[PDB]
Design a binder for this molecule. Structure first.
Ligand code: BMQ
Ligand code: BMQ
Lengths: 218, 217
C-alpha cells in the first residue's frame, strides 16, 4: 500500500493555481500525498497534476468520483493516468461493470483505483448508505484494495473496515470542516483527508502540524 | 430547450482535431452537443468556448456531478465559467448535493439535468431500485430537466410518468448500447447518440440516417 506520510492527505480544492501551489508547498514537509479533484482540475486543467509532480515530491490521487457507464469510465481513467495521477477515485453505486472498467485500465496502466463506498455528507443517508455495505462487498469480490469511507459516521466507517479487512487500504474524508475527529477516524482508516481546515487556515502549515500533533501517538 | 431534430451529439472523441471535424460534419443536423470528461480531460475546458465559437450549439456538460454539496458548488461554478449551458448531476448522492448544483445554475443562468436511472447493465445493481425515488426527489426540488435510459423503455416511460409532460427528458443509450431512436422518443424529448455517429464511417450519413428513421416525430 502507498506510504502516506503522517497518515494525512491534503484535499487541495482551491480553484486558483497560485493559491493551490502556495498552500501545497507550505505543507510539503508534513504531507507527501495530495488529493486533487475537479474544483482545481476544471479551473486549471489536467496539467496541474504535472505541475504538482514537478514542484513537489507528492503522490497524486485524482478524486474524480468516476460514475459513468463502462465505456466512458475507461476513457476517463486513461486520460487521468496519462496525465500522471497515481490513483483515481471511483464511485461504486453505478455497479460492478463500471468499477471493473476502471480496474482494468488501472491494471494495464500500472496505477490504482480507490472505491468510494459511503459518503460523508447528510445527503448520503438517502440512497448511498443503504447500498454501502453491498458496494464494499462488491469491491472485495472485484479485487479492489483501496477504499474511501466517511469520517463523519464512525459506526459506518468501522463496519466498512470490517468488510474490506485489515489488509485493504482505507482513506477517510470529513475531518475538520465536516466535524470528523482525526484520532477517532484513524482507529479504522489508514489515512485521513483534510481540506478546508488546512487550506483556508491563516497558516496552513500550522494547521497541518496541529492535526499531526493530535495523532502523534498513532 | 429546443433541440434541433431531437438529437443530441455525445462528443466523446478525445482528440481536439477529430472532435471538431466530426462535430462540424454533423452541424447541419444538430445544434446541441453533450461534452463530457473524455474530451474535457484530454483537451481542457477551453474546448467548450471553442465549440460555441465555431458552432451555433448549446453545450451540455455531462460531468455526472456526484460529490458533497460544497464540492458540487465549485464544480458547477468552474463548469459554467467555461461556458456550459447546462450540467448533468447524479441524484444518488442525495438532495443536498443536487440543491448545491441548482443554486449555482440559478446564479449563472444555466440548467441542471438530473440523472435518475443509467443505461448500462450495472445500473440494475443499485441505481434502478432508487430511480423512482430519485425522480420524485427531483420533482420535490423543482428540477425540470432529467436523464433516463433508452435501453429500458419501460423504465424511461415510468420516469416520464413521474416527472410529467412539462419536464424535459433526454435519453442516452441509443445506437451502440441497443436503444431504438423512435421508441425512445415516445417518452424522451430528445435522444443522445455518441458512437453510432462519431465512430461511423460517415458521421454525417449516420446522423442523417437516425433523423430519417424518426422523420415522422
Ligand atoms: O464522502 C466523501 C468523499 C469525498 O471524496 N469527499 C471529498 O473530500 C474533501 C473534503 O474536504 P473538507 O476537509 O471538508 O474541506 C473534498 O475534496 C470532498 O469532495 C468528502 O468530503 N466526502
Ligand atoms: O445512463 C447513462 C448516462 C449517460 O450520460 N450516458 C452517456 O451518454 C453517452 C452515450 O454514448 P453512446 O451513444 O453509447 O456512444 C456517453 O457520453 C455516456 O457517458 C450513458 O451512456 N448512459
Amino acid at each position: 500500500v502507498m506510504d502516506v506520510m503522517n497518515r494525512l492527505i491534503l484535499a487541495m480544492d482551491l480553484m486558483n493555481r497560485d493559491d493551490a501551489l502556495r498552500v501545497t508547498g507550505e505543507v510539503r514537509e508534513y504531507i507527501d500525498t495530495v488529493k486533487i479533484g475537479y474544483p482545481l482540475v476544471l479551473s486549471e486543467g489536467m496539467d496541474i497534476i504535472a505541475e504538482f509532480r514537478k514542484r513537489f515530491g507528492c503522490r497524486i490521487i485524482a478524486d474524480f468520483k468516476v460514475a459513468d457507464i463502462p465505456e466512458t469510465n475507461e476513457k476517463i481513467c486513461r486520460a487521468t493516468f496519462k496525465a500522471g495521477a497515481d490513483a483515481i477515485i471511483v464511485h461504486g453505486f453505478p455497479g460492478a461493470d463500471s468499477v471493473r472498467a476502471c480496474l482494468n485500465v488501472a491494471e494495464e496502466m500500472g496505477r490504482e483505483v480507490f472505491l468510494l463506498t459511503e459518503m460523508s455528507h447528510p445527503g448520503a443517508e438517502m440512497f448511498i448508505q443503504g447500498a454501502a455495505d453491498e458496494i464494499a462487498r462488491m469491491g472485495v469480490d472485484l479485487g479492489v484494495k483501496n477504499y474511501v469511507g466517511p469520517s463523519t459516521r464512525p459506526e459506518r466507517l468501522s463496519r466498512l473496515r470490517e468488510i474490506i479487512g485489515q489488509d485493504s487500504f482505507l482513506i477517510s474524508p470529513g475531518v475538520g470542516a465536516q466535524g470528523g475527529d482525526p484520532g477517532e477516524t484513524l482507529r479504522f482508516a489508514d489515512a485521513i483527508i483534510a481540506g478546508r481546515s488546512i487550506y483556508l487556515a491563516d497558516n496552513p502549515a500550522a494547521a497541518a502540524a496541529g492535526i499531526i500533533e493530535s495523532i502523534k501517538d498513532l
